[PDB]
Design a protein around this ligand. Structure first.
Ligand SMILES: Nc1ncnc2c1ncn2[C@@H]1O[C@H](COP(=O)(O)OP(=O)(O)O)[C@@H](O)[C@H]1O
Ligand SMILES: [Mg+2]
Ligand SMILES: [Mg+2]
Length: 299
């Protein structure tokens, strides 16, 4: 951090204790966040931010550089050919993908499958030129279980059929049981701490995203506070996805959020499930047929 203009050893310590350890978090921080660090003037705050931006080469980009920026996005397979195809390759890092649908449609299943697939190196599609092995090495997932439906057995089972060690998935998956939106949001924010602790978080799951909010802000007369809180939460999830180049997944029970990809999943005949991609920035609306068996997501 002392590389940063105006940042000496003493300021560097105040910065590390305030959570600001890497350049990107400073380069993208507001003069407000830092000035609040106390002992950090607004002058020093603006200088180090300007400095960090330069160090991280933030600025106008054009031509081939646009393709290169886009290439830093890696993708996680869902184990369903149909789905991956409709996703334009697989779940995208640096973005939030939402799977909404009726109870039993398979939302939680997809969440578990993703935690497993993260441990299958061949399931992470990326341009070796924009993303180095080390960046996706020893990947870890964080699962914010809001409904209390995380099932280690299911992880073990899906892993087995994938030919990978189930215990290895468990060892690399942090689960956080949230009983309300406050815990849910806080846990989400604490993810930076796990990364700071050396954990290569590459997959974040929020299952579910809206349950707590709906239960807490049932009154549609105070739908204001709710739509707000949820917005801040989503903003936090999106920033996480970008800064730490990781895949963020959230589920929504349904009988509009800031998710960059939005799916509506419905039950087909028996095993069959239909995932309808209805919102994305560059892909056409399309349906993917897959199934849910003892092996997890397949087809
Ligand atoms: N071990 C399993 N083997 C085959 N299918 C399973 C297994 N576990 C769960 N399922 C399927 O998952 C469905 C429920 O998926 P779930 O993700 O919990 O729904 P939701 O969308 O509400 O989260 C079940 O009704 C069952 O068909
Ligand atoms: Mg993004
Ligand atoms: Mg569920």
């Amino acid at each position: 951090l002392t590389d940063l203009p105006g940042v000496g050893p003493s300021t560097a310590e105040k910065l590390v204790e305030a959570g600001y350890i890497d350049f990107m978090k400073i380069a993208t921080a507001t003069v407000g966040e830092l000035t609040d660090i106390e002992g950090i003037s607004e002058k020093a705050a603006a200088k180090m931010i300007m400095g960090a931006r330069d160090l991280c080469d933030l600025g106008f980009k054009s031509g081939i550089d646009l393709l290169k920026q886009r290439s830093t996005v890696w993708k996680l397979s869902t184990s369903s050919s149909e789905l991956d195809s409709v996703l334009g390759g697989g779940l995208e890092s640096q973005s939030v993908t939402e799977f909404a649908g009726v109870f039993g449609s398979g939302k939680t299943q997809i969440m578990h499958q993703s935690c497993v697939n993260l441990q299958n190196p061949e399931f992470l599609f990326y341009d070796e030129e924009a993303v180095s092995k080390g960046e996706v090495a020893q990947p870890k997932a964080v699962y914010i279980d809001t409904d209390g439906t995380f099932r280690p057995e299911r992880i073990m089972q899906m892993a087995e059929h994938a030919g990978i060690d189930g215990q290895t998935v468990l060892d690399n998956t942090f689960v956080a049981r949230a009983y309300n939106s406050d815990m849910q949001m806080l846990f989400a924010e604490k993810i930076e701490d796990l990364i700071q602790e050396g954990n290569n978080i590459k997959l974040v799951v929020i299952d579910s995203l809206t349950s707590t909010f709906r239960n807490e802000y049932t009154g549609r007369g105070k739908l204001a506070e709710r739509q707000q809180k949820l917005g801040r939460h989503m903003a936090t999830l999106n920033k996480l996805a970008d800064l730490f180049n990781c895949v963020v997944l959230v589920t929504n029970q349904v009988s509009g959020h800031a998710a960059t990809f939005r799916f509506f999943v419905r039950k087909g005949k028996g095993d069959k499930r239909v995932a309808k991609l209805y919102d994305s920035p560059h892909l056409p609306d399309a349906e993917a047929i897959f199934r849910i068996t003892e092996k997890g997501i397949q087809d």
